[PDB]
């Protein structure tokens, strides 16, 4: 268990797209951002690594390691300071994704938390929930996949703290994504991403599925809300990896060639819920899938549950 790394209140991330459709990356700005947000991505990667190790069994030390890291960032007020804006709101997006990773790790490991760790971490996760939610009160902040990703941290915080108010908030974010699906299966704000339209439909599906999967921890079946809409979106994504012609036509751009990876592992859960599970076999075959922003090993969590049994 390495020492908990510094948890600064402040973030200074750098946007890295060159075009209006946020579809072409400036590699210089991407390298700059990677360096600027390295502490945040490293924190996420490690707490997820520790949570995955805990889930293997006979490794409570790993679970406690995640809690030591989370408690250290809670006590330093990590990410609750200045979201510095350079060329866009990348700092806010990083706080959304890192809150999600931290909240997922806490949800997975909290059975081992001490009394002080529970109070420290839950207060911090609720403060991050309020701060990230307040970002979305400005209607100029378009509620695309970033909004659904914000729901990951809010939902994990809601389940871990058994907070019915935060649960209602997260349900609203999930349902906003479901309600945004058009009859043809598209999410218009993701379809506007030109060569990355398929990528962003995949990336928008990921937090929606993860939220519904966390709702199962409270016995709820969120897939019954507008039942079938999420399937239309998920099926478009699976179809698009086989044949991008629909995404090509509807986005106006030939899709970037890519294989499912990382957050695409929402399919590991969703194939267990879909009325047509085998349509997702080709995506499943690209696994296993790991993503710290979604709690770690999605392939294993879909089989063993998000929260390991103590
Ligand atoms: Cl079931």
Nearest to 46 by CA among 244, 296, 239: 296
Using the mean position of ligand 1's atoms as its centre, give its distance from the Cα of residue 207 in Å: 19
78 Cα–ligand 1 center, Å: 38
Q: Could you tell me if residue 309 is inside a domain?
A: no
Span from the CA of 216 to the centroid of ligand 1 (angstroms)? 9
**Does residue 85 fall inside a structural domain?**
yes
How far apart are the CA of 219 and the centre of ligand 1, in A? 10
CA of 75 to the centre of ligand 1 (A): 39
Count of other CB atoms within 10 angstroms of residue 279: 17
Total domains in the fold of the chain:
1
Query: According to the 3-state scheme, what is the secondary structure of the chain?
Result: CCCCCCCCCCECCCCCECCCCCCCECHHHHHHHHHHCHHHHHHHHHHHHHHHHHHCCCCHHHHHHHHHHHHHHHHCCCCCCCECCCCCCHHHHHHHHHHHHHHHHHHHHHHHCCHHHHHHHHHHHHHHHHHHHHHCCCCCCCCCHHHHHHHHHHHHHHHHHCCHHHHHHHHHHHHHHHHHCCCCCCCHHHHCCHHHHHHHHHHHHHHHHHHHHHHHCCCCCHHHCCCCHHHHHHHHHHHHHHCCHHHHHHHCCCCCCCCCCHHHHHHHHHCCCCCCHHHHHHHHCCCCCEEHHHCEEHHHHHHHCCCCCC
Residue 151 domain flag: yes
Cα 302 to ligand 1 centroid, rounded to whole Å? 12
Question: To which residue do tokens 């696994």 refer?
Answer: 287
Asked, for residue 49, whether it belongs to a domain, the answer is yes
The Cα–Cα gap between 31 and 23 comes to: 16
Residue 92 lies in domain: 27-304
In a domain, 64, yes or no: yes
Rounded CA-CA distance 148/206 in Å is: 9
Cα angle, residue 294 at apex, residues 30 and 161 outer, rounded to 5°:
125
Distance 274 CA to ligand 1 centre (A): 10
- Residue 169, token pair as written in the block: 């908030």
Instruction: Give the Å distance between the CA of 41 and the centre of ligand 1.
Output: 33
- Interval between CA 105 and ligand 1 midpoint (Å): 24
* Ligand 1 midpoint to CA 113 (Å): 29
Distance between Cα 277 and ligand 1 center (Å): 13
CA of 59 to the centre of ligand 1 (A): 29
Output the CA 221–ligand 1 centroid distance in Å.
Answer: 8
In a domain, 4, yes or no: no
In a domain, 160, yes or no: yes
Q: How far is the CA of 217 from the centre of ligand 1 (A)?
A: 12
Q: Which token pair is 15?
A: 């946007």
For residue 251, report the distance from its CA to the centre of ligand 1, in Å. Answer: 35
Resolution in angstroms for this experimental structure?
1.5
Q: Is there a domain that residue 92 lies in?
A: yes
**Residues with Cβ within 8 Å of residue 297, at least 6 apart in sequence:** 52, 55, 288, 289, 290
Q: How many CA atoms lie within 13 A of 309 on its CB side?
A: 2
Distance 30 CA to ligand 1 centre (A): 41
């Amino acid at each position: 268990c390495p020492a908990p790394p510094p948890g600064s209140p402040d973030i200074r991330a750098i946007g890295y797209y060159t075009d209006a459709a946020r579809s072409v990356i400036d590699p210089r700005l991407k390298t700059q951002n990677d360096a600027a947000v390295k502490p945040l991505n490293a924190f996420a990667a490690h707490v997820a690594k520790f949570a995955d190790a805990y889930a293997k069994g006979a490794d409570e030390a790993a679970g406690r390691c995640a809690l030591t890291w989370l408690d250290a960032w809670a006590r330093s007020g990590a990410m609750l300071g200045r979201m510095a804006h350079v060329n866009n709101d990348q700092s806010d997006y990083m706080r959304q994704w890192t809150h999600g990773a931290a909240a997922m790790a806490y949800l997975r490991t909290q059975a081992l938390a001490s009394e002080q760790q529970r109070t420290d971490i839950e207060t911090w996760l609720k403060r991050l929930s309020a701060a990230n939610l307040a970002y979305w009160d400005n209607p100029k902040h378009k509620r695309n996949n970033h909004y659904y990703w914000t729901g990951v941290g809010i939902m994990a915080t809601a389940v871990a703290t058994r907070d019915d108010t935060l649960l209602n908030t997260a349900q609203g974010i999930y349902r906003a994504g479901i309600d945004a699906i058009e009859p043809d299966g598209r999410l218009p704000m993701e379809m506007a991403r030109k060569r990355l339209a398929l990528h962003y439909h995949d990336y928008a599906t990921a937090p929606l599925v993860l939220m519904a999967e966390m709702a199962r921890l409270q016995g709820e079946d969120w897939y019954t809300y507008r039942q079938g809409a999420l399937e239309r979106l998920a099926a478009r994504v699976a179809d698009g990896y086989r044949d991008p012609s629909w995404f090509n036509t509807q986005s106006g751009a030939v899709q970037e060639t890519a294989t499912p990876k990382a957050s695409s592992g929402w399919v590991e859960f969703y194939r267990l819920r879909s009325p047509d599970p085998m349509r997702f076999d080709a995506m499943h075959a690209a696994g296993p899938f790991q993503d710290p922003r979604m709690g770690g090993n999605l392939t294993l969590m879909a089989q063993e549950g998000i929260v390991p049994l103590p």
